[PDB]
Structures are given as structure tokens and as C-alpha cells.
Design a protein around this nucleic acid. Sequence first.
DNA 1: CTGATGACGT
DNA 2: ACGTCATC
Length: 430
Amino acid sequence: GPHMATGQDRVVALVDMDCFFVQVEQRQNPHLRNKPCAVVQYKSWKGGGIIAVSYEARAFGVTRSMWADDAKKLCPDLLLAQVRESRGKANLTKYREASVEVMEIMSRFAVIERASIDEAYVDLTSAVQERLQKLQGQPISADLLPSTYIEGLPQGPTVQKEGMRKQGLFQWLDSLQIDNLTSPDLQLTVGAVIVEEMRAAIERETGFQCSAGISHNKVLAKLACGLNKPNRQTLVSHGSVPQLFSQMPIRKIRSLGGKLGASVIEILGIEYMGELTQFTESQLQSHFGEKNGSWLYAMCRGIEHDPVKPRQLPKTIGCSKNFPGKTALATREQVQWWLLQLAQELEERLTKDRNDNDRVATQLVVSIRVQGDKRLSSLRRCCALTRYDAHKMSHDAFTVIKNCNTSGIQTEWSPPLTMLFLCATKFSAS
DNA sequence: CTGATGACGT
DNA sequence: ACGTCATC
Ligand SMILES: Nc1nc2c(ncn2[C@H]2C[C@H](O)[C@@H](COP(=O)(O)NP(=O)(O)OP(=O)(O)O)O2)c(=O)[nH]1
Ligand SMILES: [Mg+2]
Ligand SMILES: [Mg+2]
């Protein structure tokens, strides 16, 4: 009771851009605004692979990982923007630069951890303490929270979603003001106020909309964010967790969407995150290991300690291209030409990285997939990255993987390559 | 027919 | 160092 930690020590947000690559293209081309729209890579094969979908288009059933030709069957009026292609491959530069615009705005409010091209965690604990003292015991107006949902409310003794959002918010606030909630609840609420301000700054200064989750840790904040997309933010309190997790499929929690989550379901014979509370920490550790068992024991109670890392920039700079089926690379000259294309993009991005960020990569990682191998990576090899030179980098990459070629002929490559990947890593101050 | 990231185990 | 998982 009195000594049991509840994981309510921090206020953490996760801000994620709505259909990000789509918004980037809609900003640039107003003809695409407020329309069923998707972003695709390439065009010749099946119209290209969709990687981002506007909410108007999702209503037609259009999704990520769908071929545009198939999407067009669901949504005949679907508008498409294609990712820039340079040196024969997809080039994501425009989106990476748009990301930087957003991350820089977020960094004005608090320490952020860049978690992907379009989202970042924010530790608002300090900022919340600051705002609380400034407030002097003022109540918090619903007006300060115009886009916030409180997960789990309204409850207890209007048929439109905004009415529901407001009713839940009023119940939450009415309980704060009357002292029926906790200090952590107040801290989350102020966190949500700050997140409203951050999301407003982002939209004013970039044109992009985002959603956000506000809770006590990264996992709950990430889960909260997805609850009311697009263009809304969600507060998940410690108190909301039991009901939230009681029907929450295990795969929905970050990190349990793959093999581990499937083993939890199969071994334990359960379906929902809440059902995990019925196992001792030792039981969970027995099945899933010491680290995972401890994590699961705490997580199913809404508790998680992973810190928001102070990291605004990516740790790695990489590029890759797949060569599936017939297109797989079967000659040495082919392998070298494509390694050069990758190396040149890499050099451009690295040179720019060095000027912007005062650091240099010191390691080059080379990864390939061989034809007939199910694995994402067949082989990974590294060498020193001592110079930002595309020809040297491509030559070095070839040197590290050339032993893989089992073909007898000098000029031929077997088994054929279905993937090439170059990644610059191990950055040092410059 | 995708192109990335970051984390962890050994 | 190298392989694998997770996310999308
Ligand atoms: N190259 C590549 N880019 C991708 C892929 N998947 C996603 N992206 C890119 C395109 C995405 O726009 C972006 C951000 O990823 P999310 O946040 O996961 N999806 P979004 O922001 O689109 O919608 P939502 O409102 O649902 O958050 O990353 C992929 O498989 N390949
Ligand atoms: Mg997003
Ligand atoms: Mg995202």
C-alpha cells in the first residue's frame, strides 16, 4: 500500500504527426489538401507501394503497404504523390527536412527523444512543475484544453463525438477542482495544457497537424496518442489503466506486437494486457526472461521506467534498396554500380549532417540479403569510415562483402543480391 | 517487388 | 562483431 510505487513520477508525452508524408506533400501542393491522398514509392510496379494515407483516404479502406493500383480500386478518386527518386532509388530527404522543422519546435518546450521521422517523446515533468507554481492555485479552464480527450470519461450517471469529448473533460476537471483526484492527475492535466501549446506552435509554424498522448511513461503516452487520431490529444491517467487494459489486446502495447507478444498469449493463454496482473513477477521472468518478465509485471499495472533520452538527431544515417525477384543483382558490375548509387546518397547526407550537427560518422556498416534467404539480413559487415567519399565508401563496401560471391566466373554474382544497405554509424564530435 | 530506425542477445 | 527483433 503505502510503499507501493505507482509509476506516477513523470509526465511524458508522445507527439506524432498525422499522415506525415501526406501532409508534407499537401503543404507543397494545395491541390492535394483535404482530399483522399496517399504517398507512394516508385510507380511502375502496381502503381507503387503506399507508405502514407490521408484520413479521407483511410475511410475508403486505403492503407499503408497497399499497392496504389489496388488502392485505386477502393478509391477511384485517390490522389497520389510520389517520393522523389534520385540515383535510381527512393530519396526521403524532403520528409527528413520537414521532420527537423517539427523537432526544432518541440525542442523549445522540453527535452525530446526522436523516436522516428515523425514522432518524439517529451519529458514534461520539469515544465509542469514550473507552470504549476506560476498558476498559483488557479483552476484549469476547459478552454485551455480544446482538443484533449480524457481516456475513460465520461462515465457514470449528447450523441456526437465533440459533446462526448467535452463531457469527459468537464468530469475530469470538475474532479480536479474539487480535490477528488491526485497530484499526479493535476500534473498530467498541466502536461496536456503544455502539449496543446506545443501542437499549436507546430501547426502555426509548419502547417502540419499532429496528435499526442500524455501519460506517466513512454508506453502509455504512445498508446494514448493513437486513441483519438487525427488532430487530437489524449490523456491516460494512472487511474484509467485497469479499465483500459482489461480489453486491450496484448499486441497493441509497444514491443509486444511481434514474437514476444505472441509467446505471451500462447504460453499464458491470455488475450488482454490486464490479464497479466494475475502472474507473479517470478512467473513472468520464468517464461520471458528476467528483463522482459520484470517489464511485463510493471507494464500491465501501467508502470514503466524507460527514460526519455535527450536525443534530437538520428544515431545512424543509412540507405538501402531492395532488388526482389528477377531484378536481383547477378553481376559484379551491377553490384558495384548500385553500391555507388547508395554511397553517393550517403555522402550527400553525411556531408550535410557534418555541417549542421558538428559530428562525423566513423563506421560504415554494409548489409546484404541473398536470393532465397527469408531473413531481412543475410550478412552484416563493417569497416572504418575515414572519409566522406562516395567512391571510397562504395569500394570499401564491395571489399567487405565480395567473399560472399560463390560464383566461379569473375564477372558474375551468385547467389544474386536481393538487397543492399549502407549505414554510417559511431558518430563522434567534430 | 520498401526504406528506413533503434534496441537487444551472444 | 554480428545476428535478430520491433516498428511502420
Ligand atoms: N520508406 C518508408 N516510410 C514509411 C513506411 N511506413 C511509414 N513510413 C513513413 C510515412 C509516414 O507518413 C511516416 C510516419 O509514420 P507513421 O507515423 O507511422 N504514420 P503516419 O504519420 O503516416 O500516420 P499516422 O497519423 O497514422 O501517424 O513514416 C515504410 O514502410 N517505408
Ligand atoms: Mg504519424
Ligand atoms: Mg509515427
